[PDB]
Design a protein around this ligand. Structure first.
Ligand code: MG
Ligand code: MG
Ligand code: MG
Ligand code: MG
Ligand code: MG
Ligand code: MG
Ligand code: MG
Ligand code: MG
Ligand code: MG
Ligand code: MG
Ligand code: MG
Ligand code: MG
Ligand code: MG
Ligand code: MG
Ligand code: MG
Ligand code: MG
Ligand code: MG
Ligand code: MG
Ligand code: MG
Ligand code: MG
Ligand code: MG
Ligand code: MG
Ligand code: MG
Ligand code: MG
Ligand code: MG
Ligand code: MG
Ligand code: MG
Ligand code: MG
Ligand code: MG
Ligand code: MG
Ligand code: MG
Ligand code: MG
Ligand code: MG
Ligand code: MG
Ligand code: MG
Ligand code: MG
Ligand code: MG
Ligand code: MG
Ligand code: MG
Ligand code: MG
Ligand code: MG
Ligand code: MG
Ligand code: MG
Ligand code: MG
Ligand code: MG
Ligand code: MG
Ligand code: MG
Ligand code: MG
Ligand code: MG
Ligand code: MG
Ligand code: MG
Ligand code: MG
Ligand code: MG
Ligand code: MG
Ligand code: MG
Ligand code: MG
Ligand code: MG
Ligand code: MG
Ligand code: MG
Ligand code: MG
Ligand code: MG
Ligand code: MG
Ligand code: MG
Ligand code: MG
Ligand code: MG
Ligand code: MG
Ligand code: MG
Ligand code: MG
Ligand code: MG
Ligand code: MG
Ligand code: ZN
Ligand code: ZN
Lengths: 136, 77, 166, 38
RNA sequence: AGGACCGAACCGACUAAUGUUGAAAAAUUAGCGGAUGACUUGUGGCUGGGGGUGAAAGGCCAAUCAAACCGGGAGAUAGCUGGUUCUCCCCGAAAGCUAUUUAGGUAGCGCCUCGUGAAUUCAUCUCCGGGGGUAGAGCACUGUUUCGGCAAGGGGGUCAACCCGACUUACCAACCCGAUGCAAACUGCGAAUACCGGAGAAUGUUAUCACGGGAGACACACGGCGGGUGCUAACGUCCGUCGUGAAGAGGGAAACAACCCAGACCGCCAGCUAAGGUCCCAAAGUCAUGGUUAAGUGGGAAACGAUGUGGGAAGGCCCAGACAGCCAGGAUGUUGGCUUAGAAGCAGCCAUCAUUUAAAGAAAGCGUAAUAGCUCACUGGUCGAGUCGGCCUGCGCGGAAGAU
RNA sequence: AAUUCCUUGUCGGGUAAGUUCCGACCUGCACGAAUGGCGUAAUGAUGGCCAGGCUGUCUCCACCCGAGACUCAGUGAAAUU
RNA sequence: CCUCCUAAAGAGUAACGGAGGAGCACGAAGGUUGGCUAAUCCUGGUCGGACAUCAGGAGGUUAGUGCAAUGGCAUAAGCCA
RNA sequence: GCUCAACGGAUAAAAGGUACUCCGGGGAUAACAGGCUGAUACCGCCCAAGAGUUCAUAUCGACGGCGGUGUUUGGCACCUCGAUGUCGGCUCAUCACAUCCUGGGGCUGAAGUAGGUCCCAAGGGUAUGGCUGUUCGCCAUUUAAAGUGGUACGCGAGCUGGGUUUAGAACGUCGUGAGACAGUUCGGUCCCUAUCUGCCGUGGGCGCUGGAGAACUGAGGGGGGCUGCUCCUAGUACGAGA
RNA sequence: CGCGGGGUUGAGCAGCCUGGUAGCUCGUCGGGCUCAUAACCCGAAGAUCGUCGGUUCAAAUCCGGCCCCCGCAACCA
RNA sequence: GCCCGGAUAGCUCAGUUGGUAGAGCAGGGGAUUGAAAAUCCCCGUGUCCUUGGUUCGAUUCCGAGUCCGGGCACCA
RNA sequence: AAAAUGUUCU
């Protein structure tokens, strides 16, 4: 699973997920899976997506994972009341705005790539659309 | 059981008198931790870097020098 | 879990196992020699022996990189040859097997390696962090090229194995 | 009859059809493949 | 003989039922235990309240017991609960901060009020003077982050193994370079707003400040926007700022403190409007013009699903005949080789050409032990008008199961 | 175990079937020797379990006899609001 | 009690929100006067090594601040006399 | 000269118990149940890596995703502390459908029999015992089946009171001790004559237009709706046989 | 997952106890004694101090986190 | 009568619609003793129930007979 | 003062 190897701080504020992405273009690869839907991709979800897409391609051509789950999402255990400090970090998430290219892909036919990204998309909780390496 | 319940009393730092504010000599123009504002003309830098008026007049903020630092002067009026 | 256990067992077995006509260098047999690990010739497409200072000759397999380098450096220590009478045992195949790591692939691979008439001298094993790619090098001993080929084919047949080569 | 949220043409002989406002895969070649939205 | 046995009186009180405003403030009926004993019972006596007595349960001590009752201290004290009685007029809060053996109390300040005084004092907006370091942005810094580059430094192996060190290698790989993100506790940037000061205009009952009298209040609530916490759960919770309720009626939101509209001095069987509405319940459009849905969608919901249906610019094939049906072929070298046990388009691996060609992949799917066989792509007719499939959005459909 | 959480421990008995009972094991969470240990005939309105007998306890209620309840006449409450 | 953030760019601002510190130290570690400029890195060089000390270059405050953090600090508030 | 550190410092000087308790308060604050929520729970669906000889989708279903239900464990503390009685059983039930049986159907890795799964379907039906306070569970033997939930985990002004949950006592354990324990053990008062609603019955009054006696119609309402086995079809279809 | 304590040579214990010094007993290994093994005698080796970060001049030592252990309290309705 | 299952080193068992068979014990053989146990080494040491079939190749799949273990039917 | 034992069958 994707997770920061080291951090300044264990627990992070919830914050908000308003705005659009900066990682909007298909920078590295030829094809891209662009999050239309706003939300947060957990590390696990991302991993699953990767598995789906890599599998789909059959390790032919390279794949990028643009988003990284850098934000620790905490939870309280069951039968625990509201005080007693902020809970422990159960998992890590990447806050995805509309526009965020999530995965890029090259070294494949277009159709194949699309297929891969369909599978990948299924894994993910957010609406995602296919995109290409545009000139400029 | 937490171990983060602590915080200090807020010290009321910042600018007490702003640009074009007429001050008497003695009036604290700024309280601060560093020389985030330096002493300009007719302004003293106190021991805790508290900028205060050394004369009666209008407060005057100004970036100066090679390092581009905020100097607070007082224009004697 | 069962698969894992099986794999472990296989490994243990391998460990337990681990626990001169061969190469006639240039029309004169019974010369102190050994197969080089850079690339290990069996019935290979010709061989070449580097006459070392100590430990006699090191057989390299013809069209090797190290051998080429040696030749470039100094050609007079090198001697072209035949692969003798085919040594009764004719040992030394290292088989690199790249595979996609699921819960019970390595074990399967191990199992497939066993049963076939192959003397498993060693098994180097690791899971690469670049993906979840299990990669394994089996130091094995076998009597022919055909046999080796067959083994390779068998390995391939287990569908989780991506590619299997030396 | 499969009855899914997602009905899909599972082969070329599978045919989507709307009956009583219900999406249905019906297939001549394979009766397993026949589906319904529900 | 007996703290012996059985069993009436006598003493007791294990069970059950009844009764529970009873016949009874502990009984009755049916049974049940003891019944010559540490038994029982009459009469009189003594033991006194932190005292008695107690085969000990805090049991009993007059229906009262972890300290009897009666009287006095005494109107104990009660930061708690309740309650606090005629009328009209003006103003009108707070549920904050700080402290508190304090957290439901109280005290000072904030806000309310009454009073006196005081300046162009304050507020609105407009131009000027400012400071920001938030939103946003960014990645030189702090960290973190993916990729590509060249690569010290390790690892493997080949020369050699005492080494020097040389070679290299689908092993890992710091620094540096280029591209990529992310950050409440990062900032080589940086707003809006807010805040402070000035000048100016109109306005506003001095609305501002000071001192003095009297307070109340210091449980807040929901709504909005900015957050923390929680699960970007809660009519949750804790903050910031405004609103409303609190302390605010009226109209709307079916009903609904806090949403929307709107501030009720009184009266009127006048009119205009706000939110919201205008077929009937029910006051007002069965208004006008052009569209859309067909699901009762409206009038509850997601991923995902689908020739549902509308609108848009643009693209490929198209009377050199398309698309769909219909009629035929879909061959030769050839069983390409190889690899396999076999592989003859079709376990798979690798080349993937040419030929006769109208066209026919060293073959897309089915099919065989493999051949064979059956469809397909592609081709010519047949036929006579559009058809194909994106991506754009509009509305809709399913997904969609709960209890009187 | 009046003690044992894990626990309805496991084994055996008893039953068609037993978290109880009895017996035995010992892994005594956390028994133990006069805040006594372990035995113990007799005793017990004592606790637990089993068996025979007996039965309307029950299957599953039925009828019957009386006292209330219902109607009349007389008297005449109550908590509550 | 102090530092940051939370805190919505003046101040302030809660939570059993998220992070760390203090309960001192120093007669020099204060005053002043004069001077000096860091971490790190490369190449080289007695034992001397990845790491002591010395040459120079790159570096340009990455360091230092008696201790936490923040803000400061080259005119240095850093380091010498 | 105060770790007056509970740091605005109550005294120089202070710890526990109470189930023997008591008083004053609070739904300002818990346990019960309701409410909001739905992390968890349960039930669905989306993707389909694989498993399933072959073959993702008969049946399964990883990595993941999206919902519903209110249904477990919880969260919150809005309702109630001038009382809203708690578990279980009993007695009566009533609704929901996410159907266990019964009816209809599709697919099937459906020969038949038997199943599996999915769709529809709530009319009716839907266990006696042993053990335990239990619900639950396990076991025994049935059954066409022994549904799953809601109803104040339905129902104590209907019963019970075995459990929890007062006062007695004891064991174990912790406590110096009073005592204490979602540890155990034995013992341990369950009140209410029904005003209103409701319900089941059952009358009186008036009406329905002159009255009276009958007989009807039927708007509407209720009840009822379960199923086994055996035999025939036929040892026929099916099946190599069984 | 709330409070403490611990993890060190093969075993058990010290050290930590306020960072810089790895000790004690048993075991092990090599000798010796004996006829031979014991016991006894002599000599020796042995430890990245659970692991991972961190603070540091430097950690076993101080601090955090994670892994395993041992107490422990997990209640009142 | 019919069916189903099982038949593998000495002996316990492992491996199945098809790739030349193992784990334990036992045994061997060495060092070593007189031979052992101990200690130290090294080692399959098999008619997969026989006979046929299928196949490019059978422990396994189909027969065909045996043997054992069932589970079913049968009333002279 | 302290001094344990000797694998089996021959
Ligand atoms: Mg129909
Ligand atoms: Mg007697
Ligand atoms: Mg008496
Ligand atoms: Mg008595
Ligand atoms: Mg009783
Ligand atoms: Mg009597
Ligand atoms: Mg009596
Ligand atoms: Mg008697
Ligand atoms: Mg007397
Ligand atoms: Mg007295
Ligand atoms: Mg007295
Ligand atoms: Mg008592
Ligand atoms: Mg007293
Ligand atoms: Mg007095
Ligand atoms: Mg009084
Ligand atoms: Mg007013
Ligand atoms: Mg306070
Ligand atoms: Mg006043
Ligand atoms: Mg006034
Ligand atoms: Mg931002
Ligand atoms: Mg208060
Ligand atoms: Mg308050
Ligand atoms: Mg509050
Ligand atoms: Mg508030
Ligand atoms: Mg607000
Ligand atoms: Mg609230
Ligand atoms: Mg207000
Ligand atoms: Mg109102
Ligand atoms: Mg209203
Ligand atoms: Mg409404
Ligand atoms: Mg209204
Ligand atoms: Mg209007
Ligand atoms: Mg009207
Ligand atoms: Mg009209
Ligand atoms: Mg819909
Ligand atoms: Mg005990
Ligand atoms: Mg027990
Ligand atoms: Mg019985
Ligand atoms: Mg038993
Ligand atoms: Mg019983
Ligand atoms: Mg017993
Ligand atoms: Mg005892
Ligand atoms: Mg004693
Ligand atoms: Mg004693
Ligand atoms: Mg006794
Ligand atoms: Mg007695
Ligand atoms: Mg009467
Ligand atoms: Mg501020
Ligand atoms: Mg602000
Ligand atoms: Mg150097
Ligand atoms: Mg009371
Ligand atoms: Mg209230
Ligand atoms: Mg509750
Ligand atoms: Mg509920
Ligand atoms: Mg609840
Ligand atoms: Mg409340
Ligand atoms: Mg509240
Ligand atoms: Mg009250
Ligand atoms: Mg009341
Ligand atoms: Mg249904
Ligand atoms: Mg019904
Ligand atoms: Mg009917
Ligand atoms: Mg039962
Ligand atoms: Mg109930
Ligand atoms: Mg009850
Ligand atoms: Mg009731
Ligand atoms: Mg009881
Ligand atoms: Mg007691
Ligand atoms: Mg009763
Ligand atoms: Mg009817
Ligand atoms: Zn080589
Ligand atoms: Zn089909």
């Amino acid at each position: 699973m994707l997770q920061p190897k080291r951090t300044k701080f264990r627990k992070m504020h919830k914050g908000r997920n308003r705005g659009l992405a900066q990682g909007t273009d298909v920078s590295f690869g030829s094809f891209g899976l662009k999050a239309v839907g706003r939300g947060r991709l957990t590390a696990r979800q991302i991993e699953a997506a990767r598995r789906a897409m890599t599998r789909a391609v059959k390790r032919q051509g390279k794949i990028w994972i643009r988003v990284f789950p850098d934000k620790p999402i905490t939870e309280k255990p069951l039968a625990v009341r509201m005080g007693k400090g902020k809970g422990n970090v159960e998992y890590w998430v990447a806050l995805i705005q509309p526009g965020k290219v999530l995965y890029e892909m090259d070294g494949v036919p277009e159709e194949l790539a699309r297929e891969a990204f369909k599978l990948a998309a299924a894994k993910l909780p957010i609406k995602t659309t296919f995109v290409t390496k545009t000139v400029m | 059981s937490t171990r983060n319940g602590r915080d200090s009393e807020a010290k009321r730092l910042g600018v007490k008198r702003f640009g074009g504010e007429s001050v008497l000599a003695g009036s604290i123009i700024v309280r601060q931790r560093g020389t985030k504002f330096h002493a300009g003309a007719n302004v003293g830098c106190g021991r805790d870097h508290t900028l205060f008026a050394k004369a009666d007049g209008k407060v005057k903020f100004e970036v100066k020098g090679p390092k581009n630092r905020k100097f607070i002067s007082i224009e004697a009026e | 879990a069962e698969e894992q256990d099986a794999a472990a067992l296989k490994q243990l077995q391998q460990k337990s196992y681990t626990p001169n006509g061969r190469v006639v260098v240039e029309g004169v047999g019974n010369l102190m020699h050994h197969i080089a690990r850079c690339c290990q010739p069996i019935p290979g497409d010709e061989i070449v022996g580097f006459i070392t200072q100590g430990r006699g000759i090191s057989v390299h397999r013809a069209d090797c990189e190290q051998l080429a380098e040696l030749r470039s450096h100094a050609p007079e220590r090198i001697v072209d040859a035949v692969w003798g009478e085919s040594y009764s045992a004719g040992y030394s195949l290292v088989v690199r097997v790249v595979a996609n790591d699921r819960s019970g692939l390595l074990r399967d691979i191990t199992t497939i390696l066993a049963n076939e008439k192959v003397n498993v001298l060693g098994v180097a094993s690791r899971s690469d962090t670049k993906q979840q790619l299990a990669t394994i090098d089996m130091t094995i001993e076998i009597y022919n090229l055909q046999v080796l080929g067959r083994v390779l084919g068998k390995l391939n047949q287990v569908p989780d194995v991506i590619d299997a080569r030396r | 009859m499969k009855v899914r949220a997602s009905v899909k043409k599972l082969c070329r002989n599978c045919k989507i059809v709307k009956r009583d406002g219900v999406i249905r895969v019906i297939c001549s070649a394979e009766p397993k493949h026949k589906q319904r939205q529900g």
